[PDB]
Amino acid sequence: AQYEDGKQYTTLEKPVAGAPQVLEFFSFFCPHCYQFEEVLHISDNVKKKLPEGVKMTKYHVNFMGGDLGKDLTQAWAVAMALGVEDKVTVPLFEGVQKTQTIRSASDIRDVFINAGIKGEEYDAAWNSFVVKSLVAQQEKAAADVQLRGVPAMFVNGKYQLNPQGMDTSNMDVFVQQYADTVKYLSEK
Structure with missing residues (x-):
């Protein structure tokens, strides 16, 4: 076939029922994630080729960078609760990996204050039980699939993208191949 299990994707031994249609995992400590966000715009290019009725989920993980x-x-839960993902993603990545100004x-x-979320609003969100359950969701989704590495994308809790099996000589070609794959996996 043109798309074979074990090549552009792998299939979970342990399918995850009720999983988000498109589920992405990352860490602000994850160097490829930085590329994925800053240079490649993977999420965006995937969305642009995703169909009708399909929602996109992106979660952060704990297994990098300790405390x-x-x-x-x-x-990130706060960012999801307030809907400010697109205003903090870049300053967080750059503050962790480029400038190194995020230490606590x-x-x-x-970063959120500088992006204009108000102190009160941030501190309230940060401490809210809604954010708590949203933290639990992120942890639970990771645990549902045995996650030990990011970046990672899962489609319908059944398929996992395998970018190490795609050509990397051309960044644009890598993205479209990645996105077309998600699209294939989605129609499956």
């Missing part, structure tokens, strides 16, 4: 990693996962919770908070 800050966990803080970052609570902060307070620094994570500075």
